[PDB]
């Protein structure tokens, strides 16, 4: 039993993190195969960051301007392409340590495991989720950008997230590995800002779920609620409006537990009017959105 | 910015994990050099569990008696000899991933990085505080047993932690890597109970300064106080007390933050009587006591392995 914030073993990726530098510009690269990833900004100076044409910045590169270093050994630069806000340097070894691994976009909500690396050395791991205003709330520092997110099921690492910037809010904004941010947002010093979040209600759900089977039942109720009458209430605390694919997700929680998904939505309901009279969840005094029922049953 | 409990990254730890099956009981063995080691338990079938005499249950058994496995290749074990609660199995290969390392025996309120395995198979990474009743809160299944906590310093990985038991309650309970138990524990099947916990106050402390670095200021007040004022309120909210050494621990985050450690202990002072006002502090409704001041000082420096 317990129930914890897990993060994957963070092993796999540890042998792809690099160090990319571009004049007095160093961060971290993901080297798969014979490429190296990383954010395209790299190539920006001081005055590029308002406005930075990045097709004009990247032509008048050439291979030699990249030094890319795997721990003691440089690695040279044969090619240079952008995909979107993604720069892949093509290299002239490829990474013996490269695992199974693919590229997915994923949606708000979903979780991922974040190796935060300072000059392409690996820090620290820890769980996030896409926000749905398409942010992160990460721990990045200066030199963190091309960190990256990722889940590991069944020995095939999926990368979702490279890191691009920090915004006003001290919130995080990133790209999916093909080069698309997340979000309304640019690669660009501009003024920009996340929209208002919400909390993630079906992830909400799904702890409650994790509290009944690990053996916590104090916030049940006798009652029920149609699902508008449910999104009607919890879009008043900025929840997420909860869809019948949400309600669906949670099927097989609801058949473990017992506990009808509108059932565990009444008394989420309750938990939104009332707090917690001093009584904690998982450990917990606020209700966590940042597991998802995929992470519950891997976990419980 | 932002402030996360953060594991250590754990390749060198994974390259460690392997499979060790004694009869029906399958359970996760650390490969190092050319030694596995293991909860001794590992040879106990359920019956053996009530009353074990490990002295005699292994003294019965032979090499060939222990199946190890590190993926899909078998070691050879050609020893097999016990220290304290933890089962050494000499192979005949050494492990060619083996890191720089130590065993590490961690005092109460020190944290460390859980690699939970299943199979031999590393299955997620999460941070923990050895709580001061000898106890952790973690997160563990059947065929976790044999799962370890460690530190890295630069490149050296310091093993502190191996899995044993589930209590009562929930929390978990294992050894050092010497097989000395962390807290009142035996391995047998009997009547054991995590003693009543308290809260790390100078883990909280730590908190409040990552909570200031990050901007969250709220909580800040114009009082200070001392050692036994502050203490005698800690004593009466079942917080450890704070010593001269937990102050000095602190002093690089009350210099970074302009807030003096007794300063701070005036914000908490405050927390603890009158409540969080219905705020948060970095995310928490709780005062969270799982990072230590070196946690906070790595953190939010950017340290690196
Ligand atoms: C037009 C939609 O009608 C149905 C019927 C049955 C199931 C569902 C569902 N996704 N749970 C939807
Ligand atoms: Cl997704
Ligand atoms: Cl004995
Ligand atoms: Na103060």
Not at 16 to 35: A, I, S
Not at 63 to 78: M, P, Y
Not at 233 to 251: C, F, R, S, W
């Amino acid at each position: 039993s317990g129930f914890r914030k897990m993060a994957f073993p963070s092993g796999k990726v540890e042998g792809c993190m690099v160090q990319v530098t571009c004049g007095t510009t160093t961060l971290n690269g993901l080297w798969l195969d014979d490429v190296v990833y990383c954010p395209r900004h790299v190539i920006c100076t001081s005055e590029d960051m308002l406005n930075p044409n990045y097709e004009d910045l990247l032509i008048r590169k050439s291979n030699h301007n990249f030094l890319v270093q795997a721990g003691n050994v440089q690695l040279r630069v044969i090619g240079h392409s952008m995909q979107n806000c993604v720069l892949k340097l093509k290299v002239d070894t490829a990474n013996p340590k490269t695992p199974k691994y693919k590229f997915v976009r994923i949606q708000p909500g979903q979780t991922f495991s974040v190796l935060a690396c300072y000059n392409g050395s690996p820090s620290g791991v820890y769980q996030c989720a896409m926000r749905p205003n398409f942010t992160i709330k990460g721990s990045f520092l200066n030199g963190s950008c091309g960190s990256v997110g990722f889940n590991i099921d069944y020995d095939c690492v999926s990368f979702c997230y490279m890191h691009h910037m920090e915004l006003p809010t001290g919130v995080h904004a990133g790209t999916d590995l093909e080069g698309n941010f997340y979000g309304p947002f640019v690669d660009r010093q501009t003024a920009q800002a996340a929209g208002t979040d919400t909390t993630i209600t079906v992830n909400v759900l799904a702890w409650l779920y994790a509290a009944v089977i690990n053996g916590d039942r104090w916030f049940l109720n006798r009652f029920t609620t149609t699902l508008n009458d449910f999104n009607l209430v919890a879009m008043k605390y900025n929840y997420e409006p909860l869809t019948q694919d949400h309600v669906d997700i949670l099927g097989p929680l609801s058949a473990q537990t017992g506990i009808a998904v509108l059932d565990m939505c009444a008394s989420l309901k309750e938990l939104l009017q009332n707090g917690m009279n001093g009584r904690t969840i998982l450990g917990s005094a606020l209700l966590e959105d940042e597991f998802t029922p995929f992470d519950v049953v891997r976990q419980c």
